[PDB]
Amino acid sequence: SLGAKPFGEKKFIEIKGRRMAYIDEGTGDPILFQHGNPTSSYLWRNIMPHCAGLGRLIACDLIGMGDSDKLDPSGPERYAYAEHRDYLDALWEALDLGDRVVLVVHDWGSALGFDWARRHRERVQGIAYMEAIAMPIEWADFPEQDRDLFQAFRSQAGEELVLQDNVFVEQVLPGWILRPLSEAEMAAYREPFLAAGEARRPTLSWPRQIPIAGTPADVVAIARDYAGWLSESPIPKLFINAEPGALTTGRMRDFCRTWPNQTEITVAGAHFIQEDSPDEIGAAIAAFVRRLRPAHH
Ligand SMILES: [Cl-]
Ligand SMILES: [Cl-]
Numbered sequence: 002s003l004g005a006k007p008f009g010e011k012k013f014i015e016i017k018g019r020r021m022a023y024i025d026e027g028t029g030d031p032i033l034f035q036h037g038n039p040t041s042s043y044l045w046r047n048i049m050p051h052c053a054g055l056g057r058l059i060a061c062d063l064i065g066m067g068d069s070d071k072l073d074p075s076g077p078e079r080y081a082y083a084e085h086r087d088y089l090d091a092l093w094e095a096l097d098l099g100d101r102v103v104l105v106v107h108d109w110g111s112a113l114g115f116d117w118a119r120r121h122r123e124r125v126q127g128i129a130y131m132e133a134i135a136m137p138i139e140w141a142d143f144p145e146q147d148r149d150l151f152q153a154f155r156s157q158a159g160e161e162l163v164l165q166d167n168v169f170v171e172q173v174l175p176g177w178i179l180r181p182l183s184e185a186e187m188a189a190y191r192e193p194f195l196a197a198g199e200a201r202r203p204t205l206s207w208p209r210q211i212p213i214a215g216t217p218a219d220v221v222a223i224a225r226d227y228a229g230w231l232s233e234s235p236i237p238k239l240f241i242n243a244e245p246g247a248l249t250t251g252r253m254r255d256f257c258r259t260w261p262n263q264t265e266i267t268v269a270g271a272h273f274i275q276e277d278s279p280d281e282i283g284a285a286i287a288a289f290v291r292r293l294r295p296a297h298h
């Protein structure tokens with residue numbers, strides 16, 4: 002259903018000196034749901050129940066996000082892609098996932114998940130993805146009505162907009178959900194970012210990492226690599242397309258449509274489509290996992 006309640010209570014694991022928080026419910030091979038910016042495990046709360054009984058249902062909070070600890074010192078050089086990957090790779094190893102992982106990914110969760118999959122291909126049973134960063138893009142490929150704001154995040158305006166005014170949480174997030182959120186839902190997204198200043202740095206460092214027009218060159222190379230791999234990989238894929246969508250539209254959507262061994266649905270939503278159409282999304286993920294894990298009841 003819709004609903005504001007979280008899916009379970011979080012656990013944590015010590016990673017590199019820091020607590021990393023995660024949901025972990027049920028038994029079996031993992032179904033691993035990975036949020037991006039400026040969200041947390043809470044993004045999946047209404048989708049995960051659809052997979053009840055089908056696996057170990059796991060949703061990790063990225064470093065500095067949700068209930069995972071903040072990094073200190075923090076500043077403009079903190080919370081880049083490579084650092085998030087170093088923490089997340091460590092958490093995923095610590096979780097003892099084995100070799101039949103189904104990835105379920107969104108936004109920066111997709112860039113991280115796709116790269117992890119390229120580097121651990123035998124361990125990935127299926128990939129379900131939506132509103133993903135599936136390849137490097139140009140500014141012409143970015144949603145038109147948000148283009149100037151994202152240029153501003155990437156400029157020196159970003160610190161005031163994000164660290165002081167919290168605009169990614171307060172404006173971008175609800176602006177990319179079709180329905181109005183309740184105060185409880187907003188509170189859950191606000192929670193890790195209540196404090197002004199560096200507590201909010203992950204929500205600013207992230208737009209500064211998006212591979213657009215060849216910069217930053219390091220993440221562009223990473224995304225070029227996973228794009229090239231996915232476009233030829235025989236791993237079963239579930240593309241959860243959205244209308245109107247936001248990022249996975251135009252050129253990127255056409256590219257995703259070339260990927261092999263893939264099935265597709267389309268749901269209503271912009272970017273944070275989990276908030277508009279969670280039951281349809283969950284139902285599709287459940288059908289996908291049932292195909293991948295035939296139980297013959
Ligand atoms: Cl971002
Ligand atoms: Cl660069």
Ligand SMILES: [Mg+2]
Pocket residue numbers: 018019020
């Ligand atoms: Mg501690």
Ligand SMILES: [Mg+2]
Pocket residue numbers: 067068193
């Ligand atoms: Mg906290």
Ligand SMILES: [Mg+2]
Pocket residue numbers: 141142143144145250251
């Ligand atoms: Mg477009």
